[PDB]
Amino acid sequence: STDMWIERTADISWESDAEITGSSERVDVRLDDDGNFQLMN
Amino acid sequence: RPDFCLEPPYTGPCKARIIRYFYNAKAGLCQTFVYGGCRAKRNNFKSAEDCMRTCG
Amino acid sequence: GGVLWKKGDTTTGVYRIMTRGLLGSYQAGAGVMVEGVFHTLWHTTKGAALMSGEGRLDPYWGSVKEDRLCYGGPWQLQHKWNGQDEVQMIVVEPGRNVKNVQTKPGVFKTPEGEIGAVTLDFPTGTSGSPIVDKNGDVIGLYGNGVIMPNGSYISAIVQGERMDEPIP
């Protein structure tokens, strides 16, 4: 067997009344071979 | 015991929730912490037994 | 930098990826089921098989480097952020009902090129939550990002091209 399973929890939809937050700055990064992002590029 | 048994637990930069175990000297025993899925350090074990066997 | 290779339920939708600890059952992450395929980030399951209802789901394709993984078939998501509009993340937080949040993506400037990114800091276990554009199409997933020196968390909008259709 496996150690993990999945359970549907919602539909894929946009919510017009969704809260708005977060900023949109530009950041210089590099993607290493481990699939992880590194700063300062 | 290995030196990395002294390093503090490290969650990492990813957002998965993987309960792992780390050795806490102050407590002399192993405790659970949330591992994020990436950049794991050595003081990170899948079970309390494995953690104690290595850092006990 | 990738790997190829009873059938479980594949009802379209947003899912929670669960697992069991020696002391209880909990949410490790999330993902999205689209066109019979389950998409999530590589680091949530590390390519392990998953139970879905009565059946099992085996990984089709995955890439550590890209931190992407799909089950039951090739990657079906193909919508990308247009670098202008605001987007919405379908927050699948452990122990909480799904809620959508809107934001204006920022950008990850990489040697290869630019990647959309959102400055949203949600609890651990939300990796795999989809991000959708105006038409409700998945343009990427949340979870693979960086921890900034000021305590900020920025996640890339992880997305890939559709594996079924040609590129050109």
UniProtKB/Swiss-Prot annotation, chain B:
One Gene Ontology cellular component annotation held by this UniProt entry: extracellular space
Disulfide bond found in the keyword field: yes
Keywords: Disulfide bond, Pharmaceutical, Protease inhibitor, Secreted, Serine protease inhibitor, Signal
Boundaries of every BPTI/Kunitz inhibitor domain copy: 5-55
Protein name per Swiss-Prot or TrEMBL: Pancreatic trypsin inhibitor
Main localization category: secreted
Intrachain disulfide bonds: 5-55, 14-38, 30-51
Subcellular location per the Swiss-Prot or TrEMBL entry: Secreted
Shown segment, full-protein numbering: 36 to 91 of 100
Keyword Iron: no
GO molecular function: calcium ion binding; molecular function inhibitor activity; potassium channel inhibitor activity; protease binding; serine-type endopeptidase inhibitor activity; sulfate binding; zymogen binding
GO terms, biological process: negative regulation of platelet aggregation; negative regulation of serine-type endopeptidase activity; negative regulation of thrombin-activated receptor signaling pathway; trypsinogen activation
Site (Reactive bond for trypsin): 15-16
Summary of the function given for this chain in its UniProt record: Inhibits trypsin, kallikrein, chymotrypsin, and plasmin.
